[PDB]
């Protein structure tokens, strides 16, 4: 909520220069991921202090070089706010090495970086990564110290590897090496990795060991320093004697860019030399200037018109309120009738066990009875009241009321579309059934998992990060590093992470041909 | 534009409440037309709303036929027209109406339709639709003379022949209302099983609002299965926040529309700037980045503009609290691509039979970075009155991306003992009701528009709207009784501080 202190630890030993054709070398993948991280940590103008530590080099640069220990530990950039020096370094002047380094020594070095450099700096979170292929031998002695200072210096971790924890053209960042296509040293390293991750986080550790593809299509690199939401306190009241003291958070709040394209003169490249003049004249012909004193504040009404106690006759509300109207079956609060550019999750307030009991009772009663509250909601005294459905949502980890605003009668727009199923000019042919059914069975993005019962989704498109952000950040970076050259085309981990797994396309190739042969389309 | 003629029947029939609490069908008609007028003023739509009566004694029209009173010629709605129609609200409203408009006067539908055609004749604006929204609860108005029926039928055929639609919003007649007798072939059948006899206000009001508005494609796109197989659909947005329309500042003295230019010239020479003379800039720290406007609107092209199909994930995976922004509605526009409706019908049928969406990638227009949308199928819903309350087609859902979905803290999930859940089930069941989509109506819009209407006729104080969205707290407490006390002593300590 104030600052984070990240410490990237790239591996660049000779093993990661293993550039198998068709597959990105692990080194270039690490470059791609750290470009993603630092781009979105500089351009979004976050205040996170990154320190890059590069191991695998030929030289030595760290506070632990003494005693001829910690070779190939080059502290490329100590803890300071990230700038464009780093983003030029990441792809111009950072190159592989011929050594193979002890990444546990890299962890101990990074731990030293954070524990020392962050002495005069107040940080809320301390985070660390590693980008290793795990092809170096190492000694596990100091492991005892690692953990023995990790939790005691309050430092998280995250591990990145060229292979997952669970073939064909390796679409980087796509939606697919084999776990049996690795070496024994890699397996031993991975066992140590899993050991430390468990020792830090229980079973939740093995969700922290991401691939390099998989990290290009997730916000996993940011996952552990993301800004905490803001608790909106309020009171969910039924009647006037059932007041539940709750806190609501925003959940699905669409994300857009925070810098607008300032306009500046094409030659002197300044803004103040421009101004915008919006003066008032008669809009009809005979365009005469009309002064500000000649202009007053007026509303239309069908044909008639009104000018404009007056300023003070604004509507009034009864203050911040999260009260109920009345509960109704969850088969009548459809989803096509949601408004508002947000969603809220309503928890019972913190430090209120009784309030939690009450809201949990409310949630469970709603879920068992199969029906949802239709509450009224007003952000603060100066807000437009709105009625929205608050419907139950119980996770194994927490219970909450998901709020979504609902329409009014003067928002909807009842149209009348002619019937399709009842239509006669589009008679039901066997083509309908056979062709479209085959197509649908092909392109399914869900498969029943290894346990034949439960359903995994191949392509979880609520989990990709927004492509426009990395496109924009690539282009801004490129113009900050190549001022004389045009913008690049879109990268390939992007164009891949916005596409279905190739399995889908391959299986669907033939049904599509059937459709094109069978359903004649012709434009006018 | 679009002109519509509420062609009310003023005969004796409409004034005959069928011994019930409901309103006399003329009164439902007037409350309905007042509602349509106020509505068409809420949206700031400019369409034209005429009110006509037939079957009365007096007449105020163009050609002065018998018993045809054009109470308002084709013009935009305003405060005066709303108040004039309001004068016929309630029993006293019928009383006033039967004073300067005697009921029960013979007529001929041929002549009234000719009058309406002439109402359309005088105007000259390019109006896209012309519909006469006849209100009648008489199955065979010409049941006593064949010649009158023949001329009426020929006239209606002519009106449809000139591009005038002829609705029929029949009302609740005793013994039913068999449209087959006389009104079989008067209504422009663009099949289409007709509505039910409107019984009370709300049914008629919704049928009117569903027959007057016309679908406006929020855009027209191509849904693409591959490089080649492309169908052409229309994205209609069926719901959007109707904002309190913004003020127009007018010339102070004469109250005329005014202009608001955008003149952006140099602070040195004064010459207005061609867009080619300015580059788009952005600053980060002490560093600055400059690039041309075309290259700040083309660090975006991902797709052509349109829906391009990508998979069919079953509906169970499309969660309900993953809502990003209001959903749209995709329906085939078979005008462009001959045969698109057929394949769309096939896809909807067999997306329904298999409970499976269609996850696509949606780019509204050129130079926009796509979202991932999910076309969730949905099938028609001919309600108990034969309205269409859930039209056939692919609802289009916007799925967030991991930058959107925020991550919330949590404290240990505490759950209540099923005793408490049972008592809250009791409290829950004391407040049940049947929410229906068009139930509540905004406070701010209605309050502000009544404020306006008061200021549109120089009234002392405006009509404050009696709020609906408030909790009916007194009645609702009296409904629960002592249940709330039981719950409170169950869960909260004796010395709890909820404030």
Residue numbers in the entry:
A (entry chain B): 5 to 170, 180 to 189, 192 to 323, 327 to 542
B (entry chain A): 35 to 224, 229 to 537
Paper text:
The first position was localized at the DNA aperture in the Ku70/80 apo form but was not observed in the DNA‐bound state. The second position, which was observed in both apo and DNA‐bound states, was found below the DNA aperture, close to the helical arm of Ku70. The localization of the SAP domain in the DNA aperture suggests a function as a flexible entry gate for broken DNA.
Nonhomologous end joining (NHEJ) is a DNA repair mechanism that religates double‐strand DNA breaks to maintain genomic integrity during the entire cell cycle. The Ku70/80 complex recognizes DNA breaks and serves as an essential hub for recruitment of NHEJ components. Here, we describe intramolecular interactions of the Ku70 C‐terminal domain, known as the SAP domain. Using single‐particle cryo‐electron microscopy, mass spectrometric analysis of intermolecular cross‐linking and molecular modelling simulations, we captured variable positions of the SAP domain depending on DNA binding.
